[PDB]
Amino acid sequence: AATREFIEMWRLLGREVPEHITEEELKTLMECVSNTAKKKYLKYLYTKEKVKKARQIKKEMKAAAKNFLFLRLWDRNMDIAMGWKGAQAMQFGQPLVFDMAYENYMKRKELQNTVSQLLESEGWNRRNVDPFHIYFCNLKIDGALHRELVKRYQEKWDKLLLTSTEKSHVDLFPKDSIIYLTADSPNVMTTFRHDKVYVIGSFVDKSMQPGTSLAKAKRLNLATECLPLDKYLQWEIGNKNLTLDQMIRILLCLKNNGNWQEALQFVPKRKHTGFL
Amino acid sequence: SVKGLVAVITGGASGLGLATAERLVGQGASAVLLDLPNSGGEAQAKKLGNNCVFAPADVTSEKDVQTALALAKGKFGRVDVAVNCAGIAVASKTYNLKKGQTHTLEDFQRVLDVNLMGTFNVIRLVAGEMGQNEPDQGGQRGVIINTASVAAFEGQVGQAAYSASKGGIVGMTLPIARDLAPIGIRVMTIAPGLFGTPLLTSLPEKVCNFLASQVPFPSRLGDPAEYAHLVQAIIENPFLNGEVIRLDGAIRMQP
Amino acid sequence: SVKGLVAVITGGASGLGLATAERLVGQGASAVLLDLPNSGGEAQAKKLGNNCVFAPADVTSEKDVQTALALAKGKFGRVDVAVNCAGIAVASKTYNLKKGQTHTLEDFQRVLDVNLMGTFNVIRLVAGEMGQNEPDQGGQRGVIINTASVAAFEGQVGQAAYSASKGGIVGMTLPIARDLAPIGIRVMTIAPGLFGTPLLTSLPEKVCNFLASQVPFPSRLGDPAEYAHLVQAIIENPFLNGEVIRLDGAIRMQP
Amino acid sequence: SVKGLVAVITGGASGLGLATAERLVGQGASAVLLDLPNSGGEAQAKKLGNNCVFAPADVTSEKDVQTALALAKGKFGRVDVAVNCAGIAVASKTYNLKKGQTHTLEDFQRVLDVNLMGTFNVIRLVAGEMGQNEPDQGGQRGVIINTASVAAFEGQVGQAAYSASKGGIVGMTLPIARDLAPIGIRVMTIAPGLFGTPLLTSLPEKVCNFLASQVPFPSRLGDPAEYAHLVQAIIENPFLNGEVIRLDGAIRMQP
Amino acid sequence: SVKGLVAVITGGASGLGLATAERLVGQGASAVLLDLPNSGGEAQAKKLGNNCVFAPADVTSEKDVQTALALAKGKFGRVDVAVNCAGIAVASKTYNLKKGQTHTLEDFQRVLDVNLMGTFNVIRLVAGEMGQNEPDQGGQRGVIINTASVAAFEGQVGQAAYSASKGGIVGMTLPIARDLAPIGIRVMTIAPGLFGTPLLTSLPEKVCNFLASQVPFPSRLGDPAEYAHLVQAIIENPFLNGEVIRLDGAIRMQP
Amino acid sequence: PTQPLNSEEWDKLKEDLKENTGKTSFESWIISQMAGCHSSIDVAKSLLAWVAAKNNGIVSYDLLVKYLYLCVFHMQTSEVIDVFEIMKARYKTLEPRGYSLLIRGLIHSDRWREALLLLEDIKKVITPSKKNYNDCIQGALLHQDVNTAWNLYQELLGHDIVPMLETLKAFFDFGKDIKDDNYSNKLLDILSYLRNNQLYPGESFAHSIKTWFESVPGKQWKGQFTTVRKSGQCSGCGKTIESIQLSPEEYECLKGKIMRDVIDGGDQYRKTTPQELKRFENFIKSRPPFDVVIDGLNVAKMFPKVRESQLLLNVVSQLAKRNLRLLVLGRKHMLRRSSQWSRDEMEEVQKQASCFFADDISEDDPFLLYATLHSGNHCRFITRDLMRDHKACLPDAKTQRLFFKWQQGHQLAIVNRFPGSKLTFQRILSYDTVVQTTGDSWHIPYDEDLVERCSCEVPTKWLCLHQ
RNA sequence: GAGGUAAAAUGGCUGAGAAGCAUUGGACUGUAAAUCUAAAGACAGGGGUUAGGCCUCUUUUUACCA
Ligand SMILES: NC(=O)c1ccc[n+]([C@@H]2O[C@H](COP(=O)([O-])OP(=O)(O)OC[C@H]3O[C@@H](n4cnc5c(N)ncnc54)[C@H](O)[C@@H]3O)[C@@H](O)[C@H]2O)c1
Ligand SMILES: NC(=O)c1ccc[n+]([C@@H]2O[C@H](COP(=O)([O-])OP(=O)(O)OC[C@H]3O[C@@H](n4cnc5c(N)ncnc54)[C@H](O)[C@@H]3O)[C@@H](O)[C@H]2O)c1
Ligand SMILES: NC(=O)c1ccc[n+]([C@@H]2O[C@H](COP(=O)([O-])OP(=O)(O)OC[C@H]3O[C@@H](n4cnc5c(N)ncnc54)[C@H](O)[C@@H]3O)[C@@H](O)[C@H]2O)c1
Ligand SMILES: NC(=O)c1ccc[n+]([C@@H]2O[C@H](COP(=O)([O-])OP(=O)(O)OC[C@H]3O[C@@H](n4cnc5c(N)ncnc54)[C@H](O)[C@@H]3O)[C@@H](O)[C@H]2O)c1
Ligand SMILES: [Mg+2]
Ligand SMILES: [Zn+2]
């Protein structure tokens, strides 16, 4: 009512606000504590609207604009082959853990972004020649991460060739085999060991309190390692923390007998100047 | 008809053997559940009725199988059918270059002894008691049905030993049929696909669901009652001899 | 059970097809004998009962099979089972060096057209018919059972064309089983050996007796009633699909 | 050794036939490329030198094959080897319930007529030609090598007719070997998997990469040069007869 | 080519293994006979020359095979091919009613061990040995070629144990190929028919002459040099993997 | 343009300047520049008339808001009223800049009670800025309505907003007219707020305070602009300014809120392991209080041209000669011999001092803070670190200001810039610069208008007021 | 294995100051599925702020002080 008129008067003045707003997101706006939070949420809605209408316009543009051996059924065949390899990985694949205990240290924005990165990481893993066997540890059934994952995967969640457990990776695997990957680790990863379970924190860190993964690894005595980014790259900008999908791609490249340069090809080019 | 016949089902306390025993005892036949003492054979035998008797035995052992056959003869006086549904499975790759792991020879030998040597032990010891039967009209004294697997034709990764044992059963099916044809015993083999039994408990549940979804039709795990139906059909068909039947729903396994 | 099922038996006037029709009708099903005008199927259809009708048709032609299937739909309203038992036999050597004689291309063409092409014609039109049936509790719409020969595997001198056609049937059994899996139709094959029908009996009687003696066990020619028994077994087992069953008594042919 | 022999390859102007002709002419054998007039057989024959000749012909036509064999006699005075590689492929689903679409009988018939019937026509006529050869030390007059596919064993959705043709060749491989054993001619069959020929190399890059990844090892499409290698190995081994060899790299075709 | 390759031939002192060793050493390769101390492989290794060495081993025992592979590595530094030709044969009927005789479990166990368990033991140790090789262009590390008679497919009266062992080898050929595909090892199997070796000539001579007359073409028994030819062909073909080749001259055995 | 234009003039100007206009429309761009350069309202009115004529009497909201800005900047109340009527007629609710400009313009007119309604209308979705409250308070004070002014001030403080010093200056400037005890006590409340929140009046605000105090009846205040002598005594009277040391209650709560927050912030594994906490705590309670608490790694790393142990030994010996009881925090890796570190010099350190070595992965600074605080007020610590991060991880702002005061009082920083020179520490003030009372006397720092400051250093001038 | 100061920060990757290439769930696709459909779009994270601008505190990165 009044709010939906303030937002229109801001739209008229050239402010970054959504053209159309709905009731649930109006409630979300009113749940923002301060003026700056309201401005940020409104800008987010505005850019969502821009991108949605741009892609819809592109949809309209696209709409306006013998002896064979195989029927063209290629996508289904690829999916089924990936499923066979995923089952084989479940049986004889190397474990790769994703710790889901950071749900307390994340607000909604970074929780949703974490879910997106998890989806992309799993997608990259499925396509590989020798997939890992993935674990989602400390994933609480009633948690927010579980809800978002069962909302993004939908009815594929129960058909996913990975282990989802509400227990800890210190209970599923031997304590001495676990290596916990974190950028704050004093120790560096010289080589990829094939007998070690690697634990990646499903955590987009946008808090100003650093070293949470290291605290988790210390509370339960575990080995820690970090990628040798500084040794192999001329870092210029950006934090050393990499997205989960980049981490899994690097680990997959290393797993399939890849050198460190080929593996680190997945580090963003904007963050480093070149290779050494 | 199976009415009045006596059947010796090895590994009859669980899964496919138990289903076959249930169907046969429901059709009026008598059943001997030859199985390990550790299994729940006693409870199943009591449940089935007075026509079912449990024999604690190890198919790998000559003395145990001889004692079980003696019990069957004493109780019912003869043996008419022998079902070999006793076996074990293992999941180990021949060699793993990344992990530097090699298949254990004891694992291979254990699987080969239980699956392949126990079947032959039962076959050879049961042919003796079948030979004592007077030929029926047509000259048939008994029927032997062995359980192979589809791993004998397309085995999976980490299924080398199991595939070897099942391929051995498939290979010896016909030579034994020719051996026993002079005296009138039919030797048959069944190669089931994926069936819902305790044997599949080792696999992860999601892997089992994927494999069930990969069966062309019906897209589900097999039902032991269906294996029992095929067993009865083989028992009642005089002209089925020395052949392997794939009860797998048209599934062809992939690596 | 087969009670209430509607079956279309190709070549059902005589031989294995007639035996299958007799058994299915006796068990409570309904039968359509799809056969040639001069086969004499009208008398057999009268003999079986009111539940058996005779459809004149030549499997080699679309129109005849379509008319027969329309007749079946009109008479009974559903098609649940199909049994391909029509075929012909030809004996001729590829080349006689002594006699300077070469196999005829017309013999190969006609044997291939009747055994292999007619089977596909019937399969595809009957699959179109079954696609209209409501799925059963198991999702099944029908069953197709082709007839092959052990010549598909161990053929004999003079059986180049017969072996070719039967091997084609055996080869195409699985592709079709995968094609029709989404619909819910099960496709199976039976490969009999030396059954007592006019096709075999047309050979020299001495050869008939010798072949009867060659069978390991039972040491006799097959009984079409046993073929019908196996056909019913395939019908009643949900989990048999895309497989070839050898109903031959453990016989393997010599050159 | 193949030095001095005369080979007749059907479909010799492209793919596997061209590779076989290339290898055999390189090793010193004379070659006749029996192929359609519209293909590029003349250019290939010119490239291969004076030891290679091109014969326009249709394997489905008896007169064309007879003229090609007469040309081979005129040019080289003898026929020692025959390689049947000429065939076509057709992909078409047996029945599509959602689309209400049925397989066309003309597609099935043309696939059969080219592959299976042309193979048999060439086999019989070339056997008649080889019969005129004086026996070699060891009693051999010639060798015939047919091409098949793994579709004959496991066929993918839409490969009913192609699977039927390949399975027919596989089925008739042994009967013809037994027929021609008195004459002294060996008959063998090769079952390629996925090969880098114009059938496959024309497909998109993504699907080519997928198919290459499907082969267990080597994880690539086959090279016709090593099909020619296998053909030469068959020619050089007197004791390979009436057998099917799978040159597929351990790939089992997915549903 | 095979020049510069290191081949470990089990049972290389006698028959097929010895022929393979001779051919490979004559083609420029190196050979490590792996046989029992009493076989007399020292003399044959001396006869071949300085590219052949002898290793006293019992394939049934892990330590002996490990020591033999260590000897091969020390002598030549590398293992490229492994030809598994060791085996024994037993002729005993499963059960004899007139004679009241039963197959002994000891004979079955001994044959099974030596043929199947020893073959698996050698395969699993040589796979670890070959894992050390640097892949060549194409990614190939090694080749393993097992021997498994045609008794795997059709076994004669009294070959129950031999048929079981060879069927086991044939059954596990493909699982092991899929297991070792990532490593880049090709696993192939040869299935010879009747060959002229001590094993064959042991049994009554006129029976052997009859059996030779039963081979369609060439009638004469197989020649081990031709087994060696086929082994070399398998070594030189990159795309032969996970297949069983019958080298028997088209003979199909009878009861 | 500098003079009102005709419609044809506007059109030809549009044709010429559409080249420069760029992305936005001509009229919006031209009025934007006019607002930027403060054009007279007649020119803008002419532009709006031309736009409306072209657009059938409809002038966009943005143009009308920028015109409102122009006619509020030039203190033209009549056009502000007219624009207010136009806004009310055409729109049912306005935008916060529109509301802000309307409030800023309406405080002057007679219709100044409507600006409060506009403020309430803003309050619906957003918290009004500090300037909206400032303008409403000034409008209420100009019309002799003090109850509403104090209500608005109290609402401002209720929304946790820091009032702009202009508003407090306004209260003090208007206070002269009134002679009431309640108003004087409220002004003293404003002074106490200044004291609590560490805010310093501006020079004009200082003069306003001085005048208000001097105008009080009965008690003849005397005001002076002075400075504080190094010994913590202002020149005006010689009285001693308040001490920089913390009050005992404040010191206790700061010990508590540092232990429970900076060290074991509910985890006890992030900074250090529980074993190290227990060990350090036992070690501290074993030794009697200390006089200095050195940070070994900070004082060793100062000069890169000297070995770390060498610098540590030099500093420790120079502090030892003074008879001070030392405490040398550090890390375990300091003990193990290296090129940088040598056992001889570390043994000299452990005979001259009393050391404590933590794990190489633990954080030293919190241990430094707690050792110093546990010792007592007399204790001091040697470090160049400013400890911004540890101050950040404190619950609220009051605790952070307490920490900053204590840090000023007790931190010693090495100003020395070469190893050879003698050890000298940056000066530590003995007194705190803050608005303060001594019964009657009032001492109030302030900032000089024509200077610049930093949050590091604190005002030098003072205002001394004696009853 | 510690600090001070100043510039920088795209959480799938490139950009522009727009946009392309990707990602997730569905579609048994007749060979441009080179598709069609839904899902996800916060330029480091918090507070403020101008007529238009941009400031401020934390975290991180880099380069200097050296
Ligand atoms: N999915 C399947 O179940 C499946 C698929 C293919 C083949 N098979 C074969 O079917 C047979 C039975 O399958 P199942 O599902 O019923 O198995 P199961 O694991 O349920 O059978 C358990 C039974 O086996 C008996 N047993 C095992 N080893 C024995 C031994 N050495 N001596 C005596 N008894 C022994 C146990 O006592 C117990 O009664 C096995 O040969 C199996 O390999 C089964
Ligand atoms: N010994 C055996 O009986 C034996 C062995 C192997 C395979 N088979 C196969 O079994 C099937 C049944 O043969 P059978 O034993 O009944 O022999 P049969 O000779 O009695 O079969 C004759 C039947 O085929 C029908 N028929 C032939 N050509 C036809 C056509 N073009 N259209 C329609 N009907 C046609 C006739 O009308 C008649 O009903 C055949 O496919 C046969 O090849 C039989
Ligand atoms: N990937 C493969 O190449 C593959 C896989 C399995 C089976 N096969 C079979 O291998 C054979 C050859 O494969 P290819 O890739 O070389 O094929 P291709 O398509 O490259 O062969 C083309 C040649 O076939 C000849 N040809 C076709 N039909 C003919 C006819 N009726 N009469 C005469 N000549 C005729 C043409 O004239 C031409 O020379 C075919 O039977 C094919 O189905 C090949
Ligand atoms: N006619 C044939 O020769 C024929 C036919 C089919 C299959 N085969 C198979 O071919 C292989 C070899 O045939 P062959 O004619 O050379 O047989 P053979 O009997 O001549 O082979 C004897 C060799 O086997 C070795 N050997 C046996 N057991 C051994 C063990 N446990 N450890 C090590 N060495 C052992 C002996 O030392 C000797 O070198 C066997 O697997 C056989 O079954 C042969
Ligand atoms: Mg610090
Ligand atoms: Zn004073």
Residue numbers in the entry:
A (entry chain F): 92 to 156, 175 to 385
B (entry chain A), C (entry chain D), D (entry chain C), E (entry chain B): 7 to 261
F (entry chain E): 115 to 581
Question: Paper's wording?
Answer:
Human mitochondrial transcripts contain messenger and ribosomal RNAs flanked by transfer RNAs (tRNAs), which are excised by mitochondrial RNase (mtRNase) P and Z to liberate all RNA species. Mammalian mitochondrial RNase P is evolutionarily unique because it is a multisubunit protein complex consisting of PRORP (also known as MRPP3), which is homologous to single-subunit PRORPs, and the two additional subunits TRMT10C (also known as MRPP1) and SDR5C1 (also known as MRPP2). This multimeric complex carries out both pre-tRNA cleavage and methylation, and is thus a central player in mitochondrial gene expression. In contrast to nuclear or bacterial RNase P, mtRNase P is not a ribozyme but comprises three protein subunits that carry out RNA cleavage and methylation by unknown mechanisms.
To investigate the mechanism of mitochondrial pre-tRNA processing and methylation, we reconstituted human mtRNase P and determined its structure using single-particle cryo-EM at an overall resolution of 3.0 Å. The structure contains TRMT10C, four copies of SDR5C1, and PRORP in its active conformation. The substrate pre-tRNA is tightly bound, with the methyl-acceptor base 9 flipped into the TRMT10C methyltransferase domain and the 5′ end positioned in the PRORP active site for cleavage. Human mtRNase P adopts an elongated structure around the centrally embedded pre-tRNA. SDR5C1 forms a rectangular, symmetric tetramer, as previously reported. Its dehydrogenase active sites are near the binding interface with TRMT10C, and each SDR5C1 monomer has a NADH cofactor bound in its dehydrogenase active site. The C-terminal methyltransferase domain of TRMT10C binds on top of the SDR5C1 tetramer, with its active site facing sideways. It is anchored to the SDR5C1 tetramer by the adapter helix (TRMT10C α4, residues 183–202), which precedes the methyltransferase domain and was not included in the previous crystal structure. R181 protrudes into the anticodon loop and interacts with the C2 carbonyl of U33. This interaction is specific to pyrimidine nucleobases and is likely crucial for correct substrate recognition, as this position is conserved as U or C in tRNAs, and mutations of R181 cause mitochondrial RNA processing defects and respiratory chain deficiency in patients. The methyltransferase active site is positioned directly adjacent to the junction between the acceptor arm and the D arm, where G9 is flipped out of the tRNA fold and buried into the active site, stacking against the conserved residue V313. In the mtRNase P complex, PRORP adopts a more ‘open’ conformation with respect to the angle between its nuclease and PPR domains.
